[PDB]
Amino acid sequence: TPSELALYEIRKYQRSTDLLISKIPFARLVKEVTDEFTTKDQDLRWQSMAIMALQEASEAYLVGLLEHTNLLALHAKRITIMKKDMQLARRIRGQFI
DNA sequence: ATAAGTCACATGGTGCCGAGGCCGCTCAATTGGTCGTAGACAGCTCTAGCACCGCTTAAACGCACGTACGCGCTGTCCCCCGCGTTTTAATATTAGTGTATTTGATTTCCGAAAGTTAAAA
C-alpha cells in the first residue's frame, strides 16, 4: 500500500522525538560555512555541542516552515509545494525573505 | 634450733597492641545587631477627565440593483513518486598534534567615591 506505508511513515517520524538530518554532512556543512565566513588568518573551532544546538534550531525551523508551506499548498487545493508557494509561505512569516 | 640458705610458689608490674571513644579544625549561611537611607506618607492644589448638556449635518444605514464575479466545471495535461535499482557516500570507527582553554600571580586599570566647583533654566 503506497499511501498506507507513506502515511505510517509520516506518523513514525512525526512522533519520533529526535533530529533526522545526515550528520557528518551537516557537520562538514557548518564547518565549511564557518570557514568561508571566516577569513585568511582567524579560524574557529567547533565542539560537538555547538554543532548540536545549531542542528536542533535548523531542524525545528525547517519543520515549522514545512507545515506552513505544506499548508499554503493545501490552500492552493493541491498537495505539491512549489518554489513560489513555499517561497511566499516563508516570506509571509517574514524573516529571511 | 636455727641463721643462713636454696627453692618454688605466688603475686607484681612493666611492656606492647589494638580500638573504640571521644575530640579539632574548618567553612555555610544564619541570625544577631546596627547604621542610614528608600519608602510611605501630609497637607494639597489643580488637570485633563469626563461628563452634561445643546446644538448641527456629516456619516451611515438601509433601499434598490448590477455588473462583476465564483465556483464548481471539465477535458487533459502533466508530474510525483513508488518503487526498483545501482550506485554512493554515510556511516563510525582511531589519533596526535596543535592550538585552545586555562588558571595561576600579579599588576596595573580606572571609575566609583569624595571633595570642589563649573554651569544652568
Curated annotation (Swiss-Prot):
Residues 1-97 are annotated as: H3-like. Changing residue 44 to S: In CSE4-102; impairs nuclear division by disrupting the core centromere structure. Ubiquitinated. Is degraded through ubiquitin-mediated proteolysis when not protected by its association to the kinetochore. It is found in: Nucleus; Chromosome, Centromere. Component of centromeric nucleosomes, where DNA is wrapped around a histone octamer core. The octamer contains two molecules each of H2A, H2B, CSE4/CENPA and H4 assembled in one CSE4-H4 heterotetramer and two H2A-H2B heterodimers. Interacts with the inner kinetochore. Interacts with the central kinetochore protein CTF19. Interacts with YTA7. Histone H3-like nucleosomal protein that is specifically found in centromeric nucleosomes. Replaces conventional H3 in the nucleosome core of centromeric chromatin that serves as an assembly site for the inner kinetochore. Required for recruitment and assembly of kinetochore proteins, mitotic progression and chromosome segregation. May serve as an epigenetic mark that propagates centromere identity through replication and cell division. Required for functional chromatin architecture at the yeast 2-micron circle partitioning locus and promotes equal plasmid segregation. Mutation in CSE4 causes chromosome non-disjunction and cell cycle arrest at mitosis. Belongs to the histone H3 family. This is Histone H3-like centromeric protein CSE4. The chain holds residues 133 to 229 of 229 of the full protein.
